[PDB]
Amino acid sequence: MDVVIAVGAPLTGPNAAFGAQIQKGAEQAAKDINAAGGINGEQIKIVLGDDVSDPKQGISVANKFVADGVKFVVGHFNSGVSIPASEVYAENGILEITPAATNPVFTERGLWNTFRTCGRDDQQGGIAGKYLADHFKDAKVAIIHDKTPYGQGLADETKKAANAAGVTEVMYEGVNVGDKDFSALISKMKEAGVSIIYWGGLHTEAGLIIRQAADQGLKAKLVSGDGIVSNELASIAGDAVEGTLNTFGPDPTLRPENKELVEKFKAAGFNPEAYTLYSYAAMQAIAGAAKAAGSVEPEKVAEALKKGSFPTALGEISFDEKGDPKLPGYVMYEWKKGPDGKFTYIQQ
Template identity: 85%
Template sequence: LWNTFRTCGRDDQQGGVAGKYLADKFADAKIAIIDDKTPYGQGLAEETKKAYNAAGKKEVVREGVNTGDKDFSALIAKMKEAGVSIIYWGGLHTEAGLIIRQAKDQGLKATLVSGDGIVSNELASIAGDAVEGTLNTFGPDPTLIPENKALVEKFKAAGFNPEAYTLYSYAAVQLIAEGIKAAGSADDAEAVAKALHEKGPFKTVLGEIAFDAKGDPKLPGYVMYEWKKGPDGKYSYFQQGS
């Protein structure tokens, strides 16, 4: 679509990174791939499965659950029987938190690995202490970019932690402004879109962004995050190696 741009990657890019990570880091693990049957969750799970299978690996459980489900006892029993030690989840933090907590309660010792759909500190509220060690892919953390330090502090001073997609949304507004500036008009949407396609890269809080013909950004790839206690004693997700 001529007027559509994004500041994050696609399922196939994220799933490709996740599938390779699972194959490389958990080479001997028995893996379950579960999704929430939504376009996002199922799409991400399928792309992860595709990359995992391409690496010569095969999952032992492949299931879908419904958004809004609260009881995952039958699924967890199935995974226990299959000897699952890694659960790949395609979906959001709400069901992920329940799966993590119920798996621990039912004695399934498995690490949950997921995507950007779980990057909300609400995950820890749902999963409790069982969230520790959970892994997820996401873009490199823009709050770690030194040039963003003052902006991050400004958000926090206003009582808001700029987690997850906050700075991605901020970058989207920056790009609209840059596109208008480059086009020399705020009234001609096609000219603004053309400028965004042709006149980048543009400076944003995510770094410099240029767009391809589809409006996808040329950004650094996805990286892995781990959930653990931060300096404040609360669980959150931290970029590995940071």
Template identity: 70%
Template sequence: MRKSLLSSAVITALVAFSGTAWADMVIGVAGPMTGPNAAFGAQLLKGAEQAAADINAAGGVLGQQIKVVVGDDVSDPKQGISVANKFVGEGVKYVVGHFNSGVSIPASDVYAENGVLQITPASTNPQYTERGLWNTFRTCGRDDQQGTVAGDYIADHFKDAKIAIVHDKTPYGQGLVDVAKKVLNDKGINEVVYEGINSGEKDFSALIAKMKENGVSLIYFGGLHTEAGLIIRQSTDQGLKATLFSGDGMVSSELASIAGDGVVGTLNTFAPDPRRNPAAKDIVERFRASGFEPEAYTLYSYAALQIIAAAIERTGSADDAQKVAEAIKAGGPWKTALGDIGYDAKGDITRPDYVIYEWRKGDDGKPTYFEK
């Protein structure tokens, strides 16, 4: 009997040890995996999955393999909170995501209260990192940087244009245009139209008629490619000859599919193309070999997971995400697919990150965005 009890105890100890030594390290990836912005969700997911695969192939993190679990927020704040609670219930301590600022901000409150560290590859609204939370990081820049670059460019290149400022009423879209508007207004350049649209809206006839009536030749738009593409297409169809200028929400090949040939000449801000970074050469080749083009936020997501993994290694444990957060801020710059990334006390990157792109036809005849 004693022998049997001893064997059971030994077995229990071995199982417990085995579970600790060989358990997967679970990292959540959250974004719009379905719905109109699913192209961006795919970028976040593919980036994180490839990073996990590459890290696992090199031995994992502290001897553990990374397992990616997915949350689909459909770009909806309420669903984003549901995803956050789901991750918390599953014991997830690290999240790459979300995509939309309007989703990342409320989700980050849930994460902060439950010991979860969040790095967004794409949410650019300043309020995400301005609230003093311990857990909020991003690998992208901020709209107060992006909007300033856009406002200065418009003032230098379109100072005599009649400008319409249009946004999609989201924290990202309105936040972006209001920064550019302030830059322009401070320089004595005033818009002739300022309007908000609704995400998911399809018919922009009334807006286009108003812009035509006011002689608009430049539309500065805050929102995503789904609505921007329709505004471009319908403006072309209705005879409004105006350049659309927007932000990083345009960086999807789907924009050209929606907008048609009218997309040529469209401008947007985004970071210098990370696919051209020498640090990402082999990674980009692996993506392309798998049939996925790592445009826009793909490498930003890859870098987010790289930073999490490196900081966990530096800390020596994944158990306390708050300690890992402290290591991220104190331990950079971190080597990533985007190049070296360092952080300030808020969780923002410390390098400038925006340039101007123009949509033109490439050698294959298909429109895409080229750095100016």
């Protein structure tokens, strides 16, 4: 029978661009693997589930995956969705490999079924906090987060690392996802002499903060993490995006081995940026581990993932006992004008 693999992701809503990275990456991998002969002689059947970045909707999606005979999930994007969804999967024999959910809790619960192809926020915050101390030693820093498990989680890891390294923030504030007016917060930051805004959250609110800070004359550079890696940020923020910094893992579109794959996506009209190839690689990991296990049973595939290493678009992937990948760490990117005159993120 076909191996039923789900993409669980924000296919609509503010994070639709990330949903597309994940969906396109997983779909292309399934297509490529299928043409190569599938997984253990069976074809992958993709099903889609739109979580709209909402934990409750994510649970509905997860339960429907179960009913639909899903065996593997690539997803979700948001940590706050992936954490509760993974419980449904764990209790119903479904292996979940996230290409993008970074909060440590996801793999720190002893669950048999939880894996990632991305890093985690204690790593990411460690890098960010040290970066702040190294490059903005004397800056007045505001740590702002979006009150979600991911956003506040990353802000807290960065705070911990920054504080240890000798940077003590002057402000720590939460905002709500969906807020459109940051004038009060920006004025408070102006009064506090803030010159660095560290943002624990995603690109929609980050872009609005960047735009509004510039309009209000708050001369502060925004520094964030993986949650802002969509070219949409440049549209939302406008030209004020220039100079923004953020952490992200290796940019797999730059790996020479991926040249043809990247060109294939672009020829089909999709820019396979950021998490696209992390999702592609998640699918490759499932296929590689299933072959090694001589089984498509999710529990056996999980065991094989932890014992082996597998070629992917991210390089050779292997996993620790918790399901976290053994891959290169976070580095800092800066938003600059590219050849096309469009702003995008480039490693420093």
